[PDB]
Amino acid sequence: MDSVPGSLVVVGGTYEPWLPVLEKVGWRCTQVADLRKPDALFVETGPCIGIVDLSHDEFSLNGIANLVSSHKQVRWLAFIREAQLSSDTICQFIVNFCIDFFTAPIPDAQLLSTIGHQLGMLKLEKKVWPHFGSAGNMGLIGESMPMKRLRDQIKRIGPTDVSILIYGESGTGKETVAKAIHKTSSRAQKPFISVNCRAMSEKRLESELFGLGETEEGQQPFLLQADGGTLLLNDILTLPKSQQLNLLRFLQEGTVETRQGVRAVDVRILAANSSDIEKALIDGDFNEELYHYINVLRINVPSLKERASDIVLLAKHFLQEYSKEYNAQARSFSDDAVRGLTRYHWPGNVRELMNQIKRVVLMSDTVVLDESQLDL
Amino acid sequence: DSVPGSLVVVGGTYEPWLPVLEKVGWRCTQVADLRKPDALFVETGPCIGIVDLSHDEFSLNGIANLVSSHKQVRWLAFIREAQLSSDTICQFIVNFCIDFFTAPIPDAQLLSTIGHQLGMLKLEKKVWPHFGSAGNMGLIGESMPMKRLRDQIKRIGPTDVSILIYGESGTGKETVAKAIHKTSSRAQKPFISVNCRAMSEKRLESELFGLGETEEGQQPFLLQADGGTLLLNDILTLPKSQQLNLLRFLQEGTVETRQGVRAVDVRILAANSSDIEKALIDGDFNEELYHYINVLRINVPSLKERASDIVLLAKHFLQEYSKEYNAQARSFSDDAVRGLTRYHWPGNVRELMNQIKRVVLMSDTVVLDESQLDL
Ligand SMILES: Nc1nc2c(ncn2[C@@H]2O[C@H](COP(=O)(O)OP(=O)(O)OP(=O)(O)O)[C@@H](O)[C@H]2O)c(=O)[nH]1
Ligand SMILES: Nc1nc2c(ncn2[C@@H]2O[C@H](COP(=O)(O)OP(=O)(O)OP(=O)(O)O)[C@@H](O)[C@H]2O)c(=O)[nH]1
């Protein structure tokens, strides 16, 4: 009265031999013949077992590899059937995490042994899947097309727990993106701690990996508080060599120093950056070993220049937000302002946008804001 | 013949299942740090790896990183934990992890899961018993990041699937393309590099097969690469329309010929040097297309990283170029070597040949000094 689905892709539907030994033991085994079809089929079945009939048969090895990872990266669990082809390329093709294979004969009792191992995996996949989506909560800034690509990504790079380098132009949303992945992560209910490295002397930074005072003092390093959760370093290259070390050191031992004794913690480390990373690297101004520990995954937060259509939704949102907050009169932009609001280049991007609107709202006395009330 | 399978834990007291692997004759090696196994895993290449999380002593950031820190295919992942773990970070088995160890000791099932995976490690081990052995000249140089490159190339080469070749400018992407094509079962078959940067979209049109004012007798690169392997360097340079046709071909497996459309069989490699992520978000490169070629990736390290290769590379290029241009030069002074490595080398290995080519064509000595180089 309890089981899980496991489908297979093959031309010859006469390739029964392994279907009934799964059917009569209770499997929801589905079968696809095309290469177009099983792509559609898998996006819908979610977590399942997927057998690929290489055999002596068909399908482009590229197309299969594509399919295997397309977006079916784990809710797929790879399995492959073949006509005893232990020789050429085909064997190397099981680098594509195809965990196991089917010999030509039909080992009825032995078959379930290999396939069964994955059941615990498919069951916990169905268990960790209800994270799903949630409209990304308005996408925390705006939502168009580079933003949709961003939104989609944040969802898929969130859960991993690996370090991510969040880079983009200055004042784009990098920190808000950090929070966005921290709440998508499996450590969302746990603390989040942004840190502005730029505005800290090398001695101030010291007070972050061991703290300061000779006594408890109520100090406690930033790493101690971020336990379980996620710490963020904005402008990460700004760090002094002495501190980059400690960052790396911590990234290996998973330990901080406290006045109440050295204690180990567990903090997912994210880094923000806006300056030329390569130039700092090649010159030897930023530890490369540190860079690699942090560049495990990358996310690019697009400048407003890229999401031009987003400005108007952003401006309107900021107006509605600031006006209703400051008792202000303004309720909308004149068509003049809008058609002018996109023409602006916006160096500081979303930051420069909110700040300038904050100024305009706090000053402008009309209900409709015109282009002349804006930039000047 | 071998059986490499390592596991990382401080507390070696998680024996219970170790002798059941040890006494049947398996090479179980064990690391305590998280720093040590990073070094250990980047060099050991393909193996089986058990991670003893338990309730014990590793940062989930540190572990997830390690599990993903470029050990992406070279390492078939495994994890051990106490009966009552779960709930919180089951997500760590998004990193495939193949399977995991319950607290009890299923003696026969233990070997069942591991042995089946050992057999999988055994199939790499089938074309593997060369074991390191430096490599087939490495078609440019030889240090240790390079050995790792060969290690990859060796194991991802034969797989007839597409590879995305990324590295800095002038690193070896094309020479690597050729190198993986020479590992492929289509090595004796054509190889076709394509400089996409220096081709307008209309020249690109006449290749898939496109149009052009024809009236023609042309055979597209895909038509010529039939059976063999086609390479596109600087793939990001492609206009969407071409990205489409590339994608289109990557789905249909067909080209157009002047005498009517015929289908071919071409392994597609792509080289890249620009920030691929930024290009993706902005919408400058078709994402479904990206997935067809980013099925596997290979990273060619800049000279900056492999400094010890500079001296070995420089010597080879002097050696070849001098013998070609009747030149006098035979070696570099110690002055030159310790100065030749100090350079940052943006253009890397190509920039290395060119500057040396320049010096040879100029210098009249047999020994080149540091003052004869950069100047
Ligand atoms: N909830 C929370 N907000 C913070 C924290 N630290 C800074 N902030 C706020 O985060 C805001 C930044 O949001 P934005 O106005 O969108 O600027 P931004 O584009 O995200 O800035 P960048 O990430 O550098 O590109 C600032 O007003 C900060 O005051 C923090 O620790 N917790
Ligand atoms: N030794 C050798 N070199 C070749 C051959 N065919 C082409 N080459 C050159 O060797 C170069 C490849 O090595 P590199 O000098 O590192 O150039 P590259 O790194 O591939 O250039 P990028 O891909 O843009 O980074 C090509 O640019 C070719 O100009 C060959 O048959 N033998």
mmCIF file of N, CA and C in Angstrom, chain A residues 161-222:
data_model
loop_
_atom_site.group_PDB
_atom_site.id
_atom_site.type_symbol
_atom_site.label_atom_id
_atom_site.label_comp_id
_atom_site.label_asym_id
_atom_site.label_seq_id
_atom_site.Cartn_x
_atom_site.Cartn_y
_atom_site.Cartn_z
ATOM 1 N N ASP A 161 23.623 25.189 0.175
ATOM 2 C CA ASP A 161 24.454 25.528 1.344
ATOM 3 C C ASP A 161 25.909 25.859 1.003
ATOM 4 N N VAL A 162 26.278 25.803 -0.272
ATOM 5 C CA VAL A 162 27.656 26.114 -0.633
ATOM 6 C C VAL A 162 27.834 27.624 -0.676
ATOM 7 N N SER A 163 29.081 28.072 -0.625
ATOM 8 C CA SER A 163 29.359 29.499 -0.685
ATOM 9 C C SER A 163 29.051 30.045 -2.076
ATOM 10 N N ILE A 164 28.475 31.239 -2.121
ATOM 11 C CA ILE A 164 28.170 31.889 -3.388
ATOM 12 C C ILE A 164 28.807 33.269 -3.467
ATOM 13 N N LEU A 165 29.401 33.591 -4.613
ATOM 14 C CA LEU A 165 29.882 34.947 -4.852
ATOM 15 C C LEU A 165 28.806 35.785 -5.543
ATOM 16 N N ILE A 166 28.227 36.728 -4.809
ATOM 17 C CA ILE A 166 27.188 37.589 -5.357
ATOM 18 C C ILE A 166 27.823 38.877 -5.873
ATOM 19 N N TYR A 167 27.944 38.983 -7.191
ATOM 20 C CA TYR A 167 28.577 40.146 -7.799
ATOM 21 C C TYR A 167 27.633 40.894 -8.734
ATOM 22 N N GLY A 168 27.842 42.200 -8.828
ATOM 23 C CA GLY A 168 27.071 43.056 -9.709
ATOM 24 C C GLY A 168 27.603 44.468 -9.565
ATOM 25 N N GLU A 169 27.035 45.419 -10.300
ATOM 26 C CA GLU A 169 27.465 46.801 -10.143
ATOM 27 C C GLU A 169 27.090 47.281 -8.743
ATOM 28 N N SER A 170 27.589 48.450 -8.359
ATOM 29 C CA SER A 170 27.362 48.956 -7.010
ATOM 30 C C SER A 170 25.909 49.363 -6.803
ATOM 31 N N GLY A 171 25.325 48.922 -5.692
ATOM 32 C CA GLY A 171 23.960 49.283 -5.355
ATOM 33 C C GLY A 171 22.936 48.679 -6.298
ATOM 34 N N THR A 172 22.983 47.361 -6.463
ATOM 35 C CA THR A 172 22.110 46.692 -7.419
ATOM 36 C C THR A 172 21.084 45.807 -6.719
ATOM 37 N N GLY A 173 21.476 45.239 -5.582
ATOM 38 C CA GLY A 173 20.599 44.362 -4.829
ATOM 39 C C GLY A 173 21.305 43.140 -4.275
ATOM 40 N N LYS A 174 22.631 43.128 -4.401
ATOM 41 C CA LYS A 174 23.469 41.992 -4.012
ATOM 42 C C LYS A 174 23.169 41.466 -2.612
ATOM 43 N N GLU A 175 23.019 42.381 -1.663
ATOM 44 C CA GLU A 175 22.740 42.001 -0.289
ATOM 45 C C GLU A 175 21.322 41.454 -0.154
ATOM 46 N N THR A 176 20.366 42.095 -0.821
ATOM 47 C CA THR A 176 18.982 41.622 -0.800
ATOM 48 C C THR A 176 18.870 40.251 -1.470
ATOM 49 N N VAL A 177 19.775 39.974 -2.404
ATOM 50 C CA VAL A 177 19.838 38.668 -3.052
ATOM 51 C C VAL A 177 20.366 37.623 -2.073
ATOM 52 N N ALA A 178 21.386 38.001 -1.307
ATOM 53 C CA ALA A 178 21.911 37.155 -0.239
ATOM 54 C C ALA A 178 20.806 36.682 0.711
ATOM 55 N N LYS A 179 20.005 37.627 1.196
ATOM 56 C CA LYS A 179 18.853 37.320 2.038
ATOM 57 C C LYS A 179 17.861 36.430 1.302
ATOM 58 N N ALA A 180 17.735 36.653 -0.002
ATOM 59 C CA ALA A 180 16.805 35.895 -0.832
ATOM 60 C C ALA A 180 17.213 34.428 -0.938
ATOM 61 N N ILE A 181 18.513 34.156 -0.992
ATOM 62 C CA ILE A 181 18.965 32.770 -1.052
ATOM 63 C C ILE A 181 19.050 32.157 0.344
ATOM 64 N N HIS A 182 19.261 32.992 1.359
ATOM 65 C CA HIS A 182 19.312 32.501 2.734
ATOM 66 C C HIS A 182 17.951 32.035 3.215
ATOM 67 N N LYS A 183 16.903 32.621 2.656
ATOM 68 C CA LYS A 183 15.556 32.231 3.024
ATOM 69 C C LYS A 183 15.054 31.106 2.125
ATOM 70 N N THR A 184 15.773 30.859 1.032
ATOM 71 C CA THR A 184 15.499 29.707 0.177
ATOM 72 C C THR A 184 16.294 28.505 0.678
ATOM 73 N N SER A 185 17.391 28.788 1.372
ATOM 74 C CA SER A 185 18.243 27.751 1.945
ATOM 75 C C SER A 185 17.508 26.953 3.014
ATOM 76 N N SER A 186 17.988 25.742 3.272
ATOM 77 C CA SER A 186 17.437 24.906 4.333
ATOM 78 C C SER A 186 17.817 25.395 5.735
ATOM 79 N N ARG A 187 18.318 26.625 5.827
ATOM 80 C CA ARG A 187 18.648 27.243 7.112
ATOM 81 C C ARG A 187 17.991 28.618 7.246
ATOM 82 N N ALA A 188 16.748 28.721 6.781
ATOM 83 C CA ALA A 188 16.040 29.997 6.699
ATOM 84 C C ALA A 188 15.605 30.533 8.057
ATOM 85 N N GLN A 189 15.189 29.640 8.948
ATOM 86 C CA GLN A 189 14.712 30.047 10.266
ATOM 87 C C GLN A 189 15.869 30.478 11.160
ATOM 88 N N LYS A 190 17.084 30.217 10.698
ATOM 89 C CA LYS A 190 18.290 30.581 11.425
ATOM 90 C C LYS A 190 18.761 31.984 11.010
ATOM 91 N N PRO A 191 19.565 32.649 11.863
ATOM 92 C CA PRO A 191 20.027 34.036 11.675
ATOM 93 C C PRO A 191 20.635 34.378 10.309
ATOM 94 N N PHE A 192 20.526 35.648 9.925
ATOM 95 C CA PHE A 192 21.250 36.198 8.777
ATOM 96 C C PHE A 192 22.046 37.419 9.236
ATOM 97 N N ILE A 193 23.302 37.521 8.809
ATOM 98 C CA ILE A 193 24.173 38.611 9.255
ATOM 99 C C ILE A 193 25.012 39.196 8.115
ATOM 100 N N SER A 194 24.550 40.311 7.561
ATOM 101 C CA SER A 194 25.345 41.098 6.619
ATOM 102 C C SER A 194 26.506 41.811 7.318
ATOM 103 N N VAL A 195 27.627 41.977 6.616
ATOM 104 C CA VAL A 195 28.783 42.683 7.170
ATOM 105 C C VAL A 195 29.431 43.591 6.130
ATOM 106 N N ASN A 196 29.518 44.879 6.450
ATOM 107 C CA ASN A 196 30.146 45.853 5.566
ATOM 108 C C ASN A 196 31.644 45.959 5.820
ATOM 109 N N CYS A 197 32.419 45.189 5.065
ATOM 110 C CA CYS A 197 33.856 45.091 5.283
ATOM 111 C C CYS A 197 34.572 46.387 4.920
ATOM 112 N N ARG A 198 33.989 47.147 3.996
ATOM 113 C CA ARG A 198 34.616 48.369 3.500
ATOM 114 C C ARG A 198 34.881 49.385 4.604
ATOM 115 N N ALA A 199 33.940 49.514 5.534
ATOM 116 C CA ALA A 199 34.028 50.539 6.571
ATOM 117 C C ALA A 199 34.567 49.988 7.889
ATOM 118 N N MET A 200 35.621 49.178 7.811
ATOM 119 C CA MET A 200 36.242 48.601 9.002
ATOM 120 C C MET A 200 37.763 48.539 8.878
ATOM 121 N N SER A 201 38.463 49.135 9.841
ATOM 122 C CA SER A 201 39.922 49.058 9.896
ATOM 123 C C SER A 201 40.355 47.622 10.184
ATOM 124 N N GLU A 202 41.617 47.304 9.906
ATOM 125 C CA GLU A 202 42.108 45.937 10.068
ATOM 126 C C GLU A 202 41.980 45.451 11.514
ATOM 127 N N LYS A 203 41.944 46.387 12.457
ATOM 128 C CA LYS A 203 41.778 46.041 13.863
ATOM 129 C C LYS A 203 40.302 45.813 14.183
ATOM 130 N N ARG A 204 39.430 46.559 13.510
ATOM 131 C CA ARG A 204 37.990 46.352 13.631
ATOM 132 C C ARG A 204 37.584 44.993 13.062
ATOM 133 N N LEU A 205 38.165 44.647 11.918
ATOM 134 C CA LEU A 205 37.943 43.349 11.291
ATOM 135 C C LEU A 205 38.406 42.194 12.167
ATOM 136 N N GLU A 206 39.486 42.418 12.909
ATOM 137 C CA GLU A 206 40.007 41.423 13.837
ATOM 138 C C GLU A 206 38.906 41.016 14.813
ATOM 139 N N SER A 207 38.094 41.994 15.214
ATOM 140 C CA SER A 207 37.017 41.784 16.182
ATOM 141 C C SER A 207 35.823 41.046 15.583
ATOM 142 N N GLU A 208 36.072 40.256 14.544
ATOM 143 C CA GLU A 208 35.007 39.573 13.827
ATOM 144 C C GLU A 208 35.286 38.076 13.772
ATOM 145 N N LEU A 209 36.530 37.705 14.054
ATOM 146 C CA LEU A 209 36.943 36.310 13.987
ATOM 147 C C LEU A 209 37.484 35.836 15.334
ATOM 148 N N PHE A 210 37.358 36.695 16.344
ATOM 149 C CA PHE A 210 37.795 36.381 17.702
ATOM 150 C C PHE A 210 37.250 37.431 18.660
ATOM 151 N N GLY A 211 36.805 38.548 18.098
ATOM 152 C CA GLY A 211 36.257 39.641 18.877
ATOM 153 C C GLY A 211 37.401 40.488 19.390
ATOM 154 N N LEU A 212 37.231 41.126 20.539
ATOM 155 C CA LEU A 212 38.300 41.961 21.071
ATOM 156 C C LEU A 212 38.610 41.672 22.535
ATOM 157 N N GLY A 213 37.972 42.444 23.413
ATOM 158 C CA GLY A 213 38.285 42.516 24.833
ATOM 159 C C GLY A 213 38.819 41.302 25.574
ATOM 160 N N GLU A 214 39.653 41.584 26.572
ATOM 161 C CA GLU A 214 40.300 40.569 27.400
ATOM 162 C C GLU A 214 39.313 39.837 28.310
ATOM 163 N N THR A 215 38.081 40.333 28.346
ATOM 164 C CA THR A 215 37.025 39.808 29.204
ATOM 165 C C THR A 215 35.796 39.618 28.319
ATOM 166 N N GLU A 216 34.876 38.738 28.728
ATOM 167 C CA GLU A 216 33.610 38.507 28.016
ATOM 168 C C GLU A 216 33.099 39.775 27.339
ATOM 169 N N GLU A 217 32.970 40.841 28.128
ATOM 170 C CA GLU A 217 32.642 42.178 27.633
ATOM 171 C C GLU A 217 31.314 42.288 26.882
ATOM 172 N N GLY A 218 30.704 41.158 26.544
ATOM 173 C CA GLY A 218 29.459 41.195 25.805
ATOM 174 C C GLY A 218 29.782 41.382 24.338
ATOM 175 N N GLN A 219 30.937 40.858 23.934
ATOM 176 C CA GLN A 219 31.486 41.097 22.606
ATOM 177 C C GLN A 219 30.932 40.076 21.614
ATOM 178 N N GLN A 220 31.535 38.885 21.586
ATOM 179 C CA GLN A 220 31.129 37.769 20.714
ATOM 180 C C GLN A 220 31.282 38.079 19.221
ATOM 181 N N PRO A 221 32.187 37.354 18.540
ATOM 182 C CA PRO A 221 32.482 37.605 17.123
ATOM 183 C C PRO A 221 31.255 37.442 16.235
ATOM 184 N N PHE A 222 31.274 38.079 15.067
ATOM 185 C CA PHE A 222 30.165 38.015 14.117
ATOM 186 C C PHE A 222 29.884 36.574 13.683
#
